[PDB]
Design a protein around this ligand. Sequence first.
Ligand SMILES: [Cl-]
Lengths: 251, 251
Amino acid sequence: SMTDQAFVTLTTNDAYAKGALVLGSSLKQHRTTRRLVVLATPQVSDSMRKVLETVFDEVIMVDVLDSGDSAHLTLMKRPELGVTLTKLHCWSLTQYSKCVFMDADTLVLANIDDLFDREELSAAPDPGWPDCFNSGVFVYQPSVETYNQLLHLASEQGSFDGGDQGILNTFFSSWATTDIRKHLPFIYNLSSISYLPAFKVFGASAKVVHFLGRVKPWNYTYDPKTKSVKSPEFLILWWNIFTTNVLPLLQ
Amino acid sequence: SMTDQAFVTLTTNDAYAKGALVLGSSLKQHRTTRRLVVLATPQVSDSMRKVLETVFDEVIMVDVLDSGDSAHLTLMKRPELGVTLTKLHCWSLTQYSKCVFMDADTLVLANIDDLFDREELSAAPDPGWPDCFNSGVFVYQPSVETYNQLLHLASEQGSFDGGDQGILNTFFSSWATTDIRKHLPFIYNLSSISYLPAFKVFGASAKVVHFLGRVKPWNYTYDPKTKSVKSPEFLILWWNIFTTNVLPLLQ
Ligand SMILES: [Cl-]
């Protein structure tokens, strides 16, 4: 239908692939007309890539350890940024005129195809330092130039936070002060860590939930008997999509 | 110099007056050309009001328990909102064409007179729910109409958070989506609770620190010997301004 535009995610191992499988499924459940793309590394097992193919339209291999990879010389300068340099390959996807990147620890709650109305770089405020955008969800335009500039920046300065958010905020440094249309509503990237009164009032309209913190949805022990985890509706939802929609897909 | 414009704060008791005394002093140290105003309630002791007069140009009494007060009928509808209705009297100060309200648990680190370049309602994002502004610091235009509309809102709906921030966000509900110039940089209202890598990179430019959480700067036990508290440079600064600049003022 809309071959020109895609949601793009990233899996660097089989654990995160379970995240991507749930994200992908949630986009399908809310009936996106866009393509679904996952960037995968060789650390993702062949059998998991086959599961990824049942949900994603494209499973695109990216290996920054390969000397043919465009980011490989940058990795040799910044060996701590392998995951970040892999994610930044989202800008190499020049077969698409516009994409929404979503981290594999997000979950979609309603159709968010109206994000394609936005322009690069559109993103929600990060809680905690709200003059930085959160890099879990963003609208961007693939470009080899932009990609190479991003690699240059990573080369010169690394990332002020060790991951992709620092570098993307440093690159797209006008976000906080320029054009409010580039501020996605917080409900398009609602932090699981995120002000209870604000949530009582605004939470029902959540469109995307972003599972932050060290413990990811797929590393909870889920108990099918009780439909519950050991340690809430979003985490329960995650597991619902996984058990109900993902598990029966490779058969 | 600039009789038309003011910084405005609020003290509902003697504890908070110590906050206001420090805020006021910090505005003076960074050489504001504007007036300094404190709204005080009768719970503030006469002797503390006299201390407040050594720092503030105007100490303006507000008593919502008085039946002559404009908010008194609203208080009878919402008896839990006395402090909030007192703060909203900042909009009654029609002798001023433009003001910056600052909670008494803020501290100024550099001249912020360039806030008078902004228009109502300008405010920084709240961390945690960043599509709401934080109500600790905001640029507004005094108006009896605006004030009465605010009282009406408080009457009809109360405050979604129990304090002033809910109601001000509900009233000024276009803040998140309209005119980025109404987004104050986070450095004009930097949460003490506020992302360590972001602070390493951005904290040096802090212009206002906002002491959040249940334990206020003035309720720490300060030890003059060690220049330290029991439980960091901002809290130490607070105490420095208090001991050095405030204590010698009533003599
Ligand atoms: Cl704008």
